[PDB]
Amino acid sequence: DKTVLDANLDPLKGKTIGVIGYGNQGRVQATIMRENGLNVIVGNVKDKYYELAKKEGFEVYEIDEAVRRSDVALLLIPDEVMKEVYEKKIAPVLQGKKEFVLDFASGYNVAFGLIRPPKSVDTIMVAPRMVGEGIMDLHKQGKGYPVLLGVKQDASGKAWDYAKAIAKGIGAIPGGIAVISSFEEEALLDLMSEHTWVPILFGAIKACYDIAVKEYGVSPEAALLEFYASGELAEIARLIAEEGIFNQMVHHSTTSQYGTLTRMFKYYDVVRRIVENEAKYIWDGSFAKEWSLEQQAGYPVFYRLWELATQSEMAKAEKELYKLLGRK
Template identity: 90%
Template structure:
């Protein structure tokens, strides 16, 4: 099978009932685009504001187990941390009664680390968008596609890859974007590697730069924040990286900037590589999945404590004041924080 997929057929999904489980960030967008593409979509959700929103927007909405009963295909689009419990309480028993079913995940996490184990009679596929729902809808409105990773864990029907490609087309990824043949394990590793390495390293570096510039060199907090990220330059660099490539975009910066970036990149590389190696190993052998399960079972004590420390930092306080002046924080939003 081809590694890079630019288009596919919707035929495998024709005359099927597709249950989108969860009407949040991804669920609402994927359900809407599939309906626009002529597919028969229903929603499965707990009775909350998203349940009512789906009804208001014209979908047939059911409790999660009932939606799975009525469907031939299920897109499990709820957060990873609650997915195991929802699956075990609402979905698994229903799937055991079905001779054929396609269960799709937008993330490899729960399957890759064995937290969810569907019956052997079920096709288990992954169609994992590489962007948030809002970005998907923006591109869809422009008539554009977007990138997704495809994976198959179980091919009970012999047609699982065709279903995965059809779902990618149904949710608007292709044509116009690209679907890359991957796996649940590969997606989970890459996703967690980003979250455990370059993202926290970037955040830690910015915070260290702020603390040293302000505390040791007397730089004003406002100037530091604007230079390091608040001006929007960082976002513009990220956009250029996505469009032109991480190195080719450097031509938009001064030679002094290019020299400083390249020399320090190679200077820091070995230290950063060791961090990445350790984190990748910790993810791949299942230790992070175990750590995260234990954190959830304990009531998230580390998670909430670190959030509090982050919000109490001098950088967070200075950012809040600057963003109020810039009009980025409204009075009602401040009360929620």
């Protein structure tokens, strides 16, 4: 099957590696790779992270200098400034090359064409699905974790080899797995998760609260406690990850099972339509356009929405309560 469990690590030996950023990922991955027996450097703007990285023993230069030295580069920075940073401080130094390699952790800027490097370079992607802290929390046990792999440009016939090489160079495998796919699939998924069921969940909760209060004379404290001020949700998530989404429900009551299943099979079509709409809107690029334009405008909608959300009755009540329970 497409899956991969282990591979070689030779293509990276003898070369120097360049790491852009020392935040969550950059820090973790550079730590691991150094612990794996490789010569690696760090490129970053002069700030707290720079101080931290030079504390932990990673020789540092300026960004463009790290690329001038490196034969491989890992661009571990946000997806909102990578564009300008590339355009200014990378593309030139890169034009001055023959055989180079560039890796990302996300496919947003590439799949949509905001970054079109030369055909003189092999472009790839290695994408984990952990916030970053759990990765160390696993490495100290000597485990592995799963990731996605992708390739965009091949000028060496060695692209996948370098991909698996990196995958092993960050302790993902052996111990976990590695999938192969494109940048497009990665971006599509990372965006569907954010556009489809998360906001739906939140809106459902908000509506349940509003209703239970304003049409059945219920108290905010009780509403919050039942809905989310408890850890029921977290325990459910854990049991899912461990046993399985459906098998999990066995630990509940028959009444819960019955209602859940009925209503789920009953409300499948609506959500299906919603998901179709959003997935299409993404596959085209409309969302990238929208987001870039809002950046250029000044995040007005962002501002107003944050405001409306925090000025809501549910939020105020949650504040009073979380205060009452000593929580921060």
